[PDB]
């Protein structure tokens, strides 16, 4: 069937895997692993980096027969598109594009933090800004079940990951935001997701992200 | 008319401004000015920010009728749809997406480099990798006039914003890639784009300057 690739960790691939599972898409996981050390032993990827035939060699990637997708957003939009899980009205499409880009920013903000040696320095800064970021998502989501109304589209999967991350990082921060917390329940509650949340196709070790300082002791 | 807002500088808004001009959309510029005092931090914009009624306030932003759009790629895609400058085929759908994200990443490359003082030492590193990413873009553009075949779409606007910006950094870069070097000429030769570039309202200020907090001397 189609194949998904990324490093052996949740990361950017987490939101994609979830979608592949929600849509029951038959896929294969060919995850590369990294040798954490001062010299960053990433050979695993390098030796097959160009052997794949992708236009822009990068992880994550997906190869659907003749289709070769690169970069999360492209991949997500692809499966979603081939499953009608997109936005219809100009309004839904606008929200859709704003969200995809908005969350991506948030992912990057936290990511840099969890990657910096001076974690302790920026950490307090991030915390005293996290609530204001969330407030915006709270208001937007409102009382609608999903970010695009009654329709659960791909942006929801992206949303779940970004929110779930900040929750694991600081559970107490999203306490003041009911609709957000309950949103995470709507997602995890989805029959197909819950079943997957507890299966072999998941990370044994409780670490959600590893890149340089985090994911290693 | 529409109300496009951003700091008086090229930035992300540059690719949008060109798209608007080309599509003959009567846009209204609301260009804010950055820090004048030593601590060149955001100022005037902050006094407005929330009062605009933006779901997620951030620059740039476009306000068309009842559509308050933020995030560069959201605005870009919005206008693309309205004027049919989007990918029609699934083959073109994956292409526009990959490229969309691929270019934003590349822009980030130069940006991050500019945002830091160590520039003088990091420059050679980035410079040494330039040919690599350009080989990919050239190979992708291949023989075809535009990145999505024979018809101009929005990616060509983000591509120009990235490629051209690179030529400004080091003119020699695209020399080894004639089709990209030619692409630039062709894009700049478009009736509307030409009219816009010769008209007193095109270039605000240089790229690195102000953004990289560099004061000319
Ligand atoms: N913008 C890309 C980012 C992809 C990326 O940075 N992937 C990293 C992991 S985070 C990777 O494994 N890089 C290997 C490489 O660049 O070759 C996306 O949307 O997927
Ligand atoms: N990722 C966002 C923001 C990009 C961003 O970093 N823009 C910088 C210039 S690079 C800037 O104008 N920031 C000021 C602001 O948005 O308030 C987008 O796509 O619009």
Structure description:
The structure is a homodimer of 217-residue chains. Chain A has 217 residues and is an alpha+beta fold. Chain A has 2 domains: 1-85 and 191-217, Glutaredoxin (3-Layer(aba) Sandwich); 86-190, Up-down Bundle (Glutathione S-transferase Yfyf (Class Pi), Chain A, domain 2), CATH 1.20.1050. Chain A has 9 helices and 4 strands; from the N terminus they run βαβαββααααααα. Chain A has helices spanning 13-22, 43-46, 72-81, 90-113, 119-127, 130-141, 154-169, 178-189, 191-197, and strands at 2-5, 27-29, 61-64, 67-70. In chain A, strands 2-1-3-4 form a 4-stranded mixed sheet, with helices on one face. In chain A, helix 1 (13-22) crosses helix 7 (154-169). Chain A binds chain B through residues 55-56, 67, 69-74, 77-78, 81, 90, 93-95, 97-98, 100-102, 105, 136, 139-140, and chain B through 55-56, 67, 69-74, 77-78, 81, 90, 93-94, 97-98, 100-102, 105, 136, 139-140.
